[PDB]
Structure formats: structure tokens, C-alpha cells
Design a protein around this ligand. Structure first.
Ligand SMILES: CCCCCC(=O)SCCNC(=O)CCNC(=O)[C@H](O)C(C)(C)COP(=O)(O)OP(=O)(O)OC[C@H]1O[C@@H](n2cnc3c(N)ncnc32)[C@H](O)[C@@H]1OP(=O)(O)O
Lengths: 341, 480, 481
């Protein structure tokens, strides 16, 4: 759906059912009930752009996956979007030529230093994604909504690949209601259209708090679990750093259905962190607790398949994706499932 | 050495595992006002029907038998179910390796023979000392929740302080039932919320039963005590099939073949004034067998009613705008309540009877910025996707998108009948009657209200052999 | 620090793949064997091995990385393949839980993408110090072998001892390949058997290649065994849906001298025999074929060849041994060959010269009726194209079983030397010394001059590539076991 003008009332139902809603700056707005009614019933004066302008839907409500600076911008974005997708759920996606190089490159080697020494210092997960994707390029879905998670379409050796990656730049990469629902519907769309999911994991868990709990992060945050566990496309997961609790479970772990899971030496897989010591012995007993600050216990049990040097990520991801193009997984027999709403 | 010695040794281990550990558990749980895992299974299952599996399962390297959970199968009112129940007294109900293997075994069994699973939860989630392994096992339980979604009914009893995986797995089941005063749900507890985020809150305010039943929607019902919640679950199962292929139970019925006084009472249930309201529950009770129904989400989004009842002994799902709260308009919560209820019922082949009196959507910056478009449209999708029989009775207001959504003929309803007080139009600013819609065939009948029960029942009988074609797709992409 | 972590990873990695390889080589030196990783590198294309579960360890507390088996995926001649390789030096190569999960991960992955599994076995048996858990994982592995059967090609290399539980998974795979001097297989070992037998008389390579039939090939050394498996995979599809490889060919459009030789390969005296391999090599591309079970039941030939570049299975009676009669061992050898090929959509070319069954009290009491009928079953159940070429003798039940028209064959051509009959010079107790009665009734489609065989087989094969046959609805049949 391109929203290129007013979109109110009955006019909003079809776009909300389509898979992508793209709005145009200044000239477009969406709401069910218009600001005239918000006055007569609420006694509040709102403009149309205050109530449902493009920024509201791109940053607060999530109804819009992209806002074009102008109409040509929006249409161009849709063209590029279609160029990653298949025509339907049976035919294959386009395959493009590629200038991928056999050989470790300077971009590959930068990953060895991208992770900071200090736990209190973060990084820009986009620095990782661009090193792995062809020409360092990707079309980002919901770029201004829930910026603590990145959902994007790119290509590896010419083949469409979906990317779900926690982003530690913003909100600590945590999983909250918005990040869960943003990533969850992306995965389900890609799984519907046979696009494999590459996940870059660096998660502290779900965001707790009265605010998150009272709006239903239990039923709303778990939607991303359902999405991954239902999906049957190939799934490769690269664990960069933190991997705690429900975060590690949900972000494409092996038990949720991932086909290949590789970890960097900075990956830290455990149930909690400095929170455990205390449901457990009601500060030496704290640094004893880095039997966990590494991936080697999970590797011991086979829960990750590889511990790789970061500079090797692109090259292993590419081989992994190639090894899975013939994947075929069976599905439950049902009219449909009953995902939480 | 002797065979008789080995049998006696078995008897000693059985006493150790089931009798003495039970008195340990009753000791501690009773001091907090709770029952034990085995007590709860005994209330739930038919007497004598419980077959326990994995009695002597132990952690590997105190290692009590069972590792903290009781599992097995039994029958509830004569039909088979599987069950697990957490023992909170063993390490806070946490899931280790053995614990988890037990839960995955009874889940695989239920998927194998196609019967419901009832999980009884009283746990602090994954066991920290076992590291990634306890995350692994909770992940595998969840994976079986998803692969069971729409295949076998899954019900969660929450009977204690539940955090982490013990709130995540029930959120994938079809129904979550909490118990007053003794139970909680939250992704992590208040002590951790404070030590990590500087938020000071009690358990009751962070995730007590009332919070989840009225504010978040996580809980479909809150029992007054443990027995009330278990009875609510047993009644729920009595409306549902065992899986998505076998048929739902049919009961004897004493429905009356002709007009009764309860039928006639419907002619005067709609007030003369458009300004005055009525209790939709009076309309529902008039149509359902014995005027009876089990209400889902009774305290959440009370402007809509979701309920299970019967007509002529067959299970029927009821979705109905409720004028006695917010005038029966739709908002975010009522859309998500009714959407998932409909999708569940369609998954298990329960027909949907809809009572429509919807003036439109609740306006405000709140509704709009929290995503009424993306979230209210879930109810549209749920209706349009369902293939079960659909009967809609329009009682009064019928405006715009609200009319479209609430089981109209254009979204898929098989039979749509209107009362003379139905106002089917694009808005209200006559046209304040149902005859324009009837003129186009958008509603199939205009009936006197007393004739509702007679006509709903005939329509249901007429649609039992309904069969509808589905899209060829892995799955849809419903808005989340 | 991040760099210290990356160095710690390099240290763990060298401990796991280079130090352990030095240790493993010194110990496999005491027995004349290669190491797990050396075999993996001989098998896979250079640079294609992706190793999984490098840093797996058992949980108890000497806990070496990998728990005694190297697993991963690679390619062979460009096509994807999975592999596991037992390390006999750690724990005697015995199976524990971590060990078992590595092979189970490698197996579920090949089932997932549809590619062959080659398992390189060199295993004491089962780790008694993990109790029932060792047996559970053997059973889980075998179970995967059964559900893969006829889905993905499975090949086992026996490159060391193989006793007890270690012998079941190879037995469930499609081909077992042993190595001279270094390898064994036995359910029960020589010590318990107490009898006075050595390991190589109880279950050495010759025993399984020539007497029990457990081994489909024995390589003179490890390099030969592995080279044989590489050649085998080159004839096969990756799984039961995708096609076998097609190669280019230099075949002649007309009659050659190698074709004309077939006119004179059948001797004038009916007592005199010939080498059936002379007919087979005439017909197949380059005169080449990979023989299966070459030292077992030599009275029948089972081989993989090519015709105009496409894979073809050959089943032929061999008059140079036992006159080419059928017995228990030739029936079971050919039956399982044909059922494997049918699983994997390889057409079956039969060369028939069968005078009947080998008679005796041992054939009867050892069960020729239910073991000989396995070959009848295999032919009759197969749906793949079947072309049958009858060179000489064609008597009775042997004629019926060996690819006849009525058992399912799509095309039967007879040489003029073919004698199709209920019997030979035994009934009275040039009437039946020809095929013309069968041809009269339509039981053979063509009576050809032997020189025409290659050309007519190639034609017919091409004519049947789009063949399709509906198979019964049933969980499975009940073939006699
Ligand atoms: C299906 C979806 C996928 C699922 C993915 C996952 O599983 S990821 C899940 C991620 N994490 C979790 O599920 C864990 C969340 N749970 C917690 O953080 C905590 O347990 C809590 C918030 C409930 C706080 O519990 P408390 O510390 O208050 O303990 P409480 O007073 O209730 O009684 C607990 C007794 O048992 C211990 N105990 C409590 N919880 C424990 C636990 N999770 N692991 C180990 N031990 C625990 C306590 O140490 C104490 O024993 P002693 O005092 O005698 O020693």
C-alpha cells in the first residue's frame, strides 16, 4: 500500500491488511476516526498530522513501514522492495550477479575489532550487517520504528536474505513490545515468501517494567517466539555478544529451529547476569559466574555449532546459506495456528 | 537378591516419591495458601484415571524423584487429557534438564494421540544453575506449543508466582487461567525490576491476577480459589473437541419447539430511546441452551462479550457487542479479545454466532497512536479467514466499519438476520432501519426478535455440513 | 579484552584440530591406520569441509573436544555431502551422548537438505561408562538410518574394528565398504565366541565380502576404499527426488566392431560358457562399470554403469560361475540392489542367461523359497524403467524372475540364441531352443541380432525417461524376510 493523500475511515482497512504500508511526507495521514470527531467526543483539538501524520505511524503506532521524503522517494522504495521479493509464494525470488570475493577482506577483518573491550561500551550492529551483505547494502523495514531492532532485506551471493538483528545503539538492543511485533511480522512475511532469515543476536532479554507488563509484553513479546518456531525457511544465527534468557531463546537459537548457529568469542550465553547471584545465594561468587561470559558451555552441549573468529562471519554465513537452498521442513496439519494477538 | 526384595524396594521408592515428598510439599504450600502439584492433578482429573509417567526421573549429578514436576495422562469427564503440574517446593518450580524432558514427553504424547494438554504452573521459570540447558528445554516446550497451536487445545492454570519461561509458554497456549491472591505473572519479578531498573513495585501491581484480567489481557479468567479455576477449566474442555479433526461433544437438550415467554421477552428488550441501553447478555441467554454460557475474558474489554454455549446440544461460539460498557463500540482491547477467540474457534471447528450492536470505534489520540488500525484489523482478518459456519443477528446499531467487521455477509457470514431496530448505514449523522440492507440482499432476513432462537437454531443445523476452501499457503501474514 | 578472547579461541582451536591430530596420528600409527580427519580430507573436495560441533564435550566430571567423532559437511565432486568420522584414539571411538548428538545433528541436517551421509567407522563399540545412555544414542542413530532409507543415499566405511552396537548403523545403510587388514565387523567378538577363533576369521573383510554378504566392497587400502565411495556417489542422485548426474558421452551412431563382437560371443556348444561381462561392457559407455558385491555370489553381476551419459543399473546372470544359476546368495544380492536402485529412480537393465536354481538340501532347508522370492518381489515392486536382454538360457522360474515382461519389464528383447521354455532336455522324460514361441505370444517384444543390443537398449532407455507408475497405497509391503 502507498498512502499518498488522506486515508481515513473505511479507506484504512485494506492498507492495514497488506504487508507493507508506505506513506509520503506532508501529503498523507491515516486514522480511523478524524480530528473533527476527536473534538466533539473528547474535547481535544488535534490537527490531522498530530493525530495520524506519517511520523506518528512510522515512529509511534508502527502502521507505516516507510515514509518517503517525496512521492518519487516512496515509489522508488517500493520498486526496490519488489526487487527482493518473489512474485508469489511458489515461484523463486530473483537471483542477481554478485562481486563477492573468496578471500578475507579488509571489511571482513574489521569485525575482529568491532566489539568493544568494555561491557559498558556498545557498537552499531549496522557495522556488522553491512560487512556480511553484498555491496554492504540493505533495504531497511521500519527504520524509524523500534530502532533497538533492525529488520532488513539484502542479498548474499545474489540471493535475497532477510536480516533480523538486535541493535545495541538504541535502547540497549532490548526486546520490548514494539521490537517484538516489528520483527515478528517481518519474519512471518519472509517465511511466507520463502526468504531465509539471518539473525544477529545481542540481547539482554525482554524489557521488564510496569509499562511493558501492563500492555502485555507476555502475549505481545512472545509473538516473536511463535514467528521463529513456526518458520520453516533456512535460519542462520550469528551471536555477537550478549545472549541471555528469553532473548537468546527467541533470537534464532538452535532449539527454536535455526539451521546453523555460529558464535563469536564475545558471545555470552546464560540465563541471566549480575541478577543470578541473588536469586541464588540469598562478588567472588560473581566472577565465578563467568563460566557463562563465553560461548563455550553452549558449544559444549552442541547448542551452537561453531565458534568462529568474527572476521570469518561473511564467508561462513555464505556457505551456510548455500548449503540450505534445498531445505524442506514439514508443517503441522491445521487450518491455521492461533498465534497470540 | 530375592525377587520379593526388589518388589519391596520398588514399594519403598514409590513411597519415597509420591507419599513423603507430598507431605513435604503440603507442609510448605499450605503455609502460603496453596495446594500441591499432585493435589491439583487430583482435583482436575477424574478419580482413579491418572497414569503418572516419569515418576522416577532424576537429575544426574539432593536429586529428588521427578526433578520438580509431576506429569501424566488421565481423563476429564471421560475424555482423555494430558497434564503436568509444577512442584514449586523443589527449587522454586524451576525447569532443569530432567524436569523439561518430562514436560516434553507428555507434550509429544498429546500431539501423538490428539488430546488436550493442561499445564499447571507454579514456577520461577528456567533454572539458572543449569545455564543454557534450561533455556534450551523451555525453548523446546515452546516449540511444541507453536506446533500444537490450532491442533490440540492447550490450557494453562497459573497457580503461583510465575516468571520467565513459566509465563512465556502459557502465553502460547490457548487459555491462561489465574487464581486470586496466590498467583502472579511477569517476565521478571519486582525484586529484579528494582535492582536492575530502579522501579519499586509490588508483585500485585506488576503482575497480579487483576492486572492481567483487566489491563493486559493475558488472563482469560481469574478463579476465586484454586477449585474455582480448575472447575472453569473442566467446563471449558466440555465445549471443546479433543483436537482439530475429531468432532466436539453433543449433548441432550430440552429446547422448546415453539415460542416461549423467554422468546417473547426479546420483543421488548430494545429500548424505545436510542439514548438508552440494554444488557446484551439478556439476548444471549435467551438464545443459548438453558440460558447458559462460559464467558472468556469476562473482565477484559467489557464492551464485547466472548462466550461458549450450546444450541440444541452443540457447541456454539458467541461474539457480541455489549452496550452496557462504552456503548458497545470497538476499541483495541475488544478487537484483540474477539479476534483471537474467533481464530481459536475456527481452528477447532466451532461455529460463531454474532450479536451486533456497534456504533463505531472508540475515538482518541490514545486509540490511534497505540495502533487501532494495525490492531483493530485483527478482528476483520479473523472473521474473513474463518471458514466455520457464521450466523449474525443484528439487534441495533450497525454503522460503517463496525457493521462490516461484526460478521456481516460481505466478510463471510453464512446467514445474516436483522431485527426491526437494526440501523444499517454508513453512519448516523429514515435510513435508521434495516430495509436498505435487506433490499440489496446484504442481510438475508428481517425477523421479529422473539423468533431469534428459532431461526438461529435452524441455521446452525443447516450449516453443519458446511465445507469451505482455504488459500494454498504456508500461513497468512495477519497483522501483529 | 576482545583480542584476548579471539586468541583464546585460536588456542582452543589448535588444541582441538592440530594437537589432537598429532596425538591421534601417533596412536593410529601403532595399527597402520589413518586418522579421522585424514580420511575426511581424502574423501571431500579440498577446502570444502565445514566442521560442526568442534568444541562439544561430554558433561561428566579427560574431556577432549569433539568427544571422539569429527562431523560436518562438504562436497564430493562438487555435490553436497555430510560425513562423520570416528576417532578410535579417544575412548576407543565408543559412542557417548555428546558423540551421539554430533552424529544425530549431522544426520538430521542431511535429511533436511537431501544429501548423502557417509559415515567413517572405527569404533570400539559403546561407552560402558555412560550406561544405558550409550545404547539410547545408538538406537536414535539407527532410527534415523531407517527413516532415511530410500530417501537419501547412505554409505558406511568400515576402517577399523566395528563390534556390537557399532555394526547396526552400517547394516542399515545402503552400502558397506571395508578395508583389507585393518577392519572387522562382528556382533559378538572373538573372545566371547569361549571358542578358539581370531577376529579376522570371525569377521574379517574376506568373510563379509565372500560369505556373509555384509560388505559390498573391500578396498586394498584406505585410499582405494574411499576412492570407490567417491565413484559410487558419482552414479547416484543426491536424494529420492532430484535427478542423478548426466555426463557427456562419445557413443557411436552406427555399428562398431565392439557391437559386432556380440554376434560371436555366444558359443556354438550349449555346454560352453562365456563371460557375461563381455556383453555388459559392450553396451555401457566406455566399457566401464562399478560392480557391487563383486566377490559375493559371483553367479550374478550387479553393477552401476552409464548409457548415453545416464546412470543405469545392470543385473546379469554370470555363466562363468555355477553356470549362472540362481541361489540364496545371488537372490539376496540382486534383490537389495534392485530395491535400492528403484528407491533412487535408476533404470534397471537385465541380461538374462539363467538355467534355473542351484539344487540341494541346503538350498531348501536354508530357505530358498522365502529368500529366493525376494528377487521376484524386488523386480515386481519396482516402477523404474526395466529393459531386459535375453542372451541365452531362459528356463522356468529363473526366466520369470530375471526381468521378464510379466514381472514388470517395459521392454524385452531376445537374442536368437535365447531358449525360452519351461524346461530343457528334461521334459521328454529345436522345439524350445529359440525365442520364437515367446515372441509369437508377445512375451518378448523384439528378436534382435546381438550386434543391435547397444543401439536398441539406448533407444528404449530414452523412450522411458518420462515413465510414471502409480504405486499401491499402503504403509509398506510385507516382503519375505
Ligand atoms: C516458551 C517460551 C520460551 C522460553 C524461553 C526461556 O525459558 S528463557 C527464561 C528466562 N528466565 C527465567 O525463566 C527465570 C525467571 N525467574 C526469575 O528471575 C526468578 O526466579 C524470580 C523472578 C521468580 C525470583 O524468584 P525468587 O528469587 O524470588 O525465589 P522464591 O522466593 O520465589 O523461591 C525460590 C526458591 O527457589 C530458588 N529459585 C527461584 N527461581 C529460581 C530459578 N529460576 N532458578 C533456580 N533457582 C530458583 C530460589 O533460589 C529459592 O530457593 P533457595 O532460597 O532455597 O535457594
Amino acid at each position: 500500500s502507498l498512502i499518498m493523500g488522506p486515508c481515513a475511515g473505511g479507506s484504512v482497512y485494506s492498507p492495514a491488511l497488506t504487508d507493507f504500508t508506505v506513506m509520503v511526507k506532508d501529503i498523507s495521514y491515516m486514522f480511523v476516526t478524524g480530528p473533527e470527531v476527536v473534538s466533539a467526543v473528547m474535547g481535544e483539538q488535534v490537527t490531522a498530522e498530530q493525530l495520524g501524520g506519517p511520523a506518528v505511524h512510522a515512529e509511534v503506532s508502527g502502521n507505516a513501514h516507510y515514509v518517503g521524503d517525496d512521492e518519487q522517494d516512496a515509489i522508488s522504495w517500493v520498486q526496490t522492495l519488489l526487487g527482493y521479493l518473489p512474485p508469489n509464494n511458489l515461484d523463486p525470488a530473483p537471483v542477481y550477479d554478485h562481486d563477492c570475493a573468496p578471500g578475507i577482506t579488509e571489511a571482513d577483518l574489521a569485525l575482529d575489532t568491532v566489539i568493544p573491550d568494555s561491557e559498558q561500551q556498545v557498537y552499531d550492529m549496522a557495522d556488522v550487517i553491512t560487512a556480511v551483505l553484498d555491496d554492504g547494502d540493505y533495504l531497511e523495514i521500519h527504520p524509524d520504528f523500534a530502532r533497538n531492532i533492525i529488520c532488513a532485506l539484502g542479498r548474499v551471493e545474489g540471493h535475497s536474505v532477510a536480516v533480523v538483528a538486535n541493535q545495541p545503539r538504541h535502547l540497549a538492543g532490548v526486546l520490548d513490545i514494539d521490537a517484538s511485533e516489528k520483527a515478528a511480522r517481518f519474519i512471518r512475511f519472509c517465511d511466507s515468501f520463502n526468504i531465509p532469515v539471518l539473525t544477529f543476536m545481542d540481547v539482554p532479554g525482554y524489557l521488564p517494567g510496569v509499562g511493558q507488563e501492563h500492555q502485555g509484553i507476555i502475549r505481545r513479546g512472545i509473538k516473536l517466539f511463535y514467528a521463529y518456531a513456526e518458520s520453516t525457511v533456512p535460519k542462520i544465527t550469528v551471536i555477537t555478544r550478549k545472549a541471555y534468557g528469553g532473548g537468546y531463546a527467541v533470537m534464532g537459537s538452535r532449539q527454536i529451529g535455526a539451521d546453523r548457529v555460529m558464535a563469536w568469542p564475545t558471545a555470552e550465553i546464560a540465563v541471566m547476569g549480575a541478577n543470578s547471584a541473588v536469586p541464588i545465594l540469598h562478588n567472588l561468587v560473581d566472577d565465578y559466574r563467568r563460566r557463562f561470559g563465553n560461548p563455550y558451555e553452549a558449544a559444549a552441549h552442541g547448542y551452537v555449532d561453531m565458534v568462529i573468529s568474527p572476521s570469518r562471519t561473511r564467508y561462513e554465513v555464505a556457505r551456510a546459506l548455500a548449503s540450505l537452498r534445498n531445505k524442506r521442513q514439514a508443517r503441522p496439519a491445521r487450518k491455521h495456528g492461533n498465534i497470540p494477538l | 537378591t530375592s525377587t520379593a526384595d526388589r518388589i519391596a524396594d520398588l514399594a519403598a521408592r514409590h513411597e519415597e516419591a509420591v507419599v513423603l515428598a507430598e507431605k513435604k510439599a503440603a507442609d510448605r504450600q499450605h503455609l502460603k495458601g496453596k495446594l500441591t502439584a499432585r493435589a491439583r492433578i487430583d482435583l482436575l482429573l477424574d478419580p482413579g484415571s491418572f497414569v503418572e509417567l516419569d515418576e522416577f526421573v532424576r537429575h544426574r549429578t539432593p536429586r529428588p524423584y521427578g526433578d520438580g514436576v509431576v506429569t501424566g495422562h488421565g481423563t476429564i469427564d471421560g475424555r482423555q487429557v494430558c497434564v503436568f503440574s509444577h512442584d514449586f517446593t523443589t527449587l522454586g518450580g524451576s525447569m532443569g534438564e530432567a524436569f523439561g524432558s518430562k514436560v516434553v514427553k507428555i507434550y509429544d504424547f498429546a500431539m501423538s494421540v490428539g488430546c488436550p494438554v493442561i499445564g499447571i504452573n507454579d514456577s520461577g521459570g528456567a533454572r539458572i544453575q543449569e545455564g543454557v540447558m534450561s533455556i534450551a528445554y523451555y525453548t523446546e516446550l515452546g516449540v511444541r506449543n507453536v506446533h500444537s497451536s490450532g491442533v490440540i487445545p492447550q490450557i494453562s492454570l497459573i497457580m503461583g508466582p510465575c516468571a520467565g519461561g513459566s509465563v512465556y509458554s502459557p502465553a502460547l497456549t490457548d487459555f491462561t487461567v489465574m487464581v486470586k491472591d496466590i498467583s502472579y505473572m511477569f517476565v521478571t519479578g519486582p525484586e529484579v525490576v528494582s535492582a536492575v531498573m530502579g522501579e519499586q513495585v509490588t508483585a500485585e501491581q506488576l503482575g497480579g491476577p487483576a492486572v492481567h484480567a483487566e489491563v493486559s489481557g493475558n488472563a482469560h479468567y481469574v478463579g476465586d480459589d484454586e477449585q474455582d479455576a480448575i472447575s472453569w477449566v473442566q467446563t471449558l474442555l466440555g465445549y471443546l473437541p479433543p483436537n482439530n479433526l475429531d468432532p466436539a461433544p453433543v449433548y441432550d437438550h430440552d429446547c422448546a419447539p415453539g415460542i416461549t415467554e423467554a422468546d417473547l421477552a426479546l420483543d421488548t428488550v430494545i429500548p424505545d430511546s436510542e439514548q438508552q441501553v440494554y444488557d446484551m447478555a439478556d439476548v444471549i441467554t435467551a438464545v443459548l441452551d438453558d440460558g447458559d454460557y462460559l464467558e472468556i475474558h469476562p473482565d477484559f474489554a467489557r464492551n464485547i462479550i466472548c462466550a461458549l454455549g450450546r444450541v440444541e446440544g452443540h457447541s456454539v461460539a458467541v461474539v457480541a457487542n455489549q452496550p452496557r460498557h462504552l456503548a458497545g463500540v470497538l476499541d483495541i482491547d475488544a478487537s484483540e479479545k474477539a479476534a483471537r477467540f474467533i481464530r481459536f474457534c475456527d481452528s477447532f471447528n466451532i461455529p460463531v454466532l454474532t450479536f451486533m450492536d456497534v456504533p463505531g470505534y472508540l475515538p482518541g489520540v490514545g486509540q490511534e497512536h497505540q495502533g487501532i488500525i494495525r490492531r483493530g484489523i485483527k478482528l476483520f482478518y479473523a472473521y474473513a479467514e474463518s471458514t466455520v459456519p457464521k450466523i449474525t443477528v443484528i439487534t441495533r446499531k450497525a454503522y460503517g466499519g463496525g457493521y462490516a467487521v461484526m460478521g456481516s455477509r460481505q466478510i463471510g457470514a453464512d446467514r445474516v438476520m436483522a431485527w426491526p431496530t437494526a440501523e444499517i448505514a454508513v453512519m448516523g449523522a429514515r435510513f435508521g432501519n434495516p430495509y436498505e440492507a435487506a433490499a440489496h440482499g446484504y442481510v438475508d432476513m428481517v425477523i421479529s426478535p422473539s423468533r431469534t432462537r428459532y431461526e438461529v437454531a435452524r441455521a446452525l443445523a443447516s450449516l453443519r455440513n458446511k465445507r469451505q476452501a482455504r488459500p494454498a499457503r504456508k500461513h497468512g501474514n495477519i497483522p501483529l
